[PDB]
Design a protein around this ligand. Structure first.
Ligand SMILES: *Cc1c(COP(=O)(O)O)cnc(C)c1O
Ligand SMILES: *Cc1c(COP(=O)(O)O)cnc(C)c1O
Lengths: 405, 405
């Protein structure tokens, strides 16, 4: 059982004041605050054990290399991959998706083929596929939305066919909070021989994730949303697919031999996908974030967060003219619009009260278009957020509506 | 005028002990140690002002965005670019070169064209061009080396022709320490209409760099060698070329509009080349590293380093059977082999004495092949290194040779 006061004491930013008022940070879905255990693990590495990591012979380099490969193993256990060698360190979810789109996509998606995404996807899980489709002459097909923010799954029979090579789908929507029924969609996709890439950027901080039970071919997530540093993320790929993938970036460490007259040969997976000095400091920090979350327990986090969400949804019913977008069982985020006020103005007033929410299209323009709105406000209710911050959001929306209505 | 004792007091790792002995870190060319000003600037950002940066409406996000764009401006002044908008944040030199090779390369290098590199290049400035040449049917031409580690510039007339699209060349060799005559090579290249990419990963920490005086089209460097955090680097591109470059990675923030029926449009340079959440923590750290180096003064650093180098080369003359590779006016690094002992063994003994050097091919296999050796040892003599550490290296090589000879 969870203690929000003890969790909050680990996060130095939560004591901050903004505009002379106490900060209510409701924007973790854009990027999470980081516990002092994470900030200090990276700082301590730089202050005491820093070195280059390419299996250097000297002591510091050999120890830094082992720290990096231990984080690879820890991340692999966190998502229940079968092996540490199925995980590639990238800059974040976006880079992971681009790596798959070029390395797997360029060799497996041909002219006349199709790829399926959904209308709720974030731009990170849209744009790389649009680019691939334009390079190879393939078609980007779209699973449409229902008004409650769930996918229209009855349309799958018209979208999947013998030319469908890939399903790229979000685990959890960054706007709606919808959790998609991945295991069943993946079963469907595999019956056609299609691979499945899952965008898990908003899933990994809310409940346990198991890629062997999901049976996904590719899974991606970013460290900075998982209470860790920026500049680091994970791409998981089934071993059999990753072993056939050609390299994306070229340079040092991803090669086996380099010759200017006989050409270059590549090293084995995962190292073939990691060119140049890695973000070692970010990798040490991510390892600490995974330990921090695992010590609190994801089932404990999920229980507290669901209870906070239930409290917020119940309190938000007393805000006049509030429109909510997404299903009632939403995870993590609440997307809303207040009466006819533009989201930018509502978010500006909320910021003037010390409450940080995100406003705009949330990198999901197609999703905004589906709802016929230019933008939305979004409150994130993470594990370190409280009932009191929910009460300040409800009061603030009531005040805004009184003032501007 | 420089004070090495005061500079060393800012670097927490330099007090460390390794194998029960005092650390002599002579591997800065692989990755540099970081001053507490740099480590703390990043930690302080995470502890007090952390937020997502995509011009968010709330206060923390708006301030984080401004911190990031101020670092872009500071980096642009450090290399004397004309504008902050000519600089793109990447993971490091390697990613920068891959970005240019795909985005500029794919649209400007065609079947039957050629690209020129040199035989001293690091793999980061070789492999992306080999990959581009294989994608488009172009030829990779090579400027050969002279025994003293300098380029055979008399071969340029046979390598440059009407089909030469690009010269990709190192500013300063990571093994030899040779500084190439960039301004004159760039004049030559531009007479043929060829563009020039400069690999400045080993130049920016040793003396002032001026891209307007060099007139290079592309310039790249990494933060971790410049006393800053890992996971962050800079790609500089002349405005007129960058403005015509299409995007490489796709996703959030690099778009202007995203549509699933009308396609996607891109934002302007530099932001079109930066997809997804940036490495904000690394960018804050890099800004602090640039301030730290500029406050010591690069001409002061260069004077101390050149004097230390002159002392080392003079002391190394008393090591029996030492072979040195590179010119006498080398910068930063000393590449060597001891008698007939394999470099791995020499480096292992040096590590047993607490002295960290790099051994192996240094991501420059063609350079090792040129000298007909499998590997070399390399000592780096950076601004925080001392005469005493040089004396320990000389004694250690003398002891190793006595013991194994
Ligand atoms: C280290 C180095 C590179 C690669 O830098 P990364 O930071 O590993 O991407 C490229 N060129 C030279 C000359 C180098 O020394
Ligand atoms: C934030 C997010 C992304 C992009 O992550 P980056 O860390 O910015 O690369 C992709 N998908 C979803 C669902 C997200 O929430």
């Amino acid at each position: 059982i969870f203690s929000v006061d003890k969790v909050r004491a680990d996060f130095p930013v939560l004591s901050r004041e903004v505009n002379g008022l106490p900060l209510a940070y409701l924007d973790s879905a854009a990027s999470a605050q980081k516990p002092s255990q994470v900030i200090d693990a990276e700082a301590e590495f730089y202050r005491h054990g820093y070195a280059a990591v390419h299996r250097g012979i000297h002591t510091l380099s050999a120890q830094a290399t082992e720290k990096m490969e231990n984080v690879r193993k820890r991340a692999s256990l966190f998502i229940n991959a079968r092996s540490a060698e199925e995980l590639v360190f990238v800059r974040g979810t976006t880079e992971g998706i681009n790596l798959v789109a070029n390395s797997w996509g360029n060799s497996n998606v041909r002219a006349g083929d199709n790829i399926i995404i959904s209308q709720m996807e974030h731009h990170a899980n849209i744009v790389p596929w649009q680019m691939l489709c334009a390079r190879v002459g393939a078609e980007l097909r779209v699973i449409p939305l229902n008004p409650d923010g769930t996918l229209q799954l009855e349309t799958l029979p018209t979208l999947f066919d013998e030319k469908t090579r890939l399903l790229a789908i979000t685990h959890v929507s960054n706007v709606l909070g919808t959790e998609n029924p991945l295991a069943e969609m993946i079963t469907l996709a595999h019956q056609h021989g299609a691979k499945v890439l899952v965008d898990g950027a908003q899933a990994v901080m809310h409940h346990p994730v198991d890629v062997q039970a999901l049976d996904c071919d590719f899974y991606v997530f970013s460290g900075h949303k998982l209470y860790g540093p920026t500049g680091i993320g994970i791409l998981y790929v089934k071993e059999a697919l990753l072993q056939e993938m050609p390299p994306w970036e070229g340079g040092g460490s991803m090669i086996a031999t380099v010759s200017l007259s006989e050409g270059t040969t590549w090293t084995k997976a995962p190292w073939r996908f990691e060119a140049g000095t890695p973000n070692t400091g970010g990798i040490i920090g991510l390892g600490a974030a995974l330990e921090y979350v695992s010590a609190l327990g994801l089932n404990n986090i999920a229980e507290y967060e669901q209870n906070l969400m239930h409290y917020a949804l119940s309190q938000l019913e007393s805000v006049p003219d509030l429109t909510l977008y997404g299903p009632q069982n939403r995870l993590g985020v609440i997307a809303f619009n207040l009466g006819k006020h533009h989201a930018y103005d509502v978010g500006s007033f909320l910021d003037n009260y010390g409450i940080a929410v995100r406003t705009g299209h949330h990198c999901a323009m197609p999703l905004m278009a589906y709802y016929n709105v230019p933008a939305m406000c979004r409150a994130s209710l993470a594990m370190y957020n409280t009932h009191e911050e929910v009460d300040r959001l409800v009061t603030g929306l009531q005040r805004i509506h009184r003032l501007l209505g």
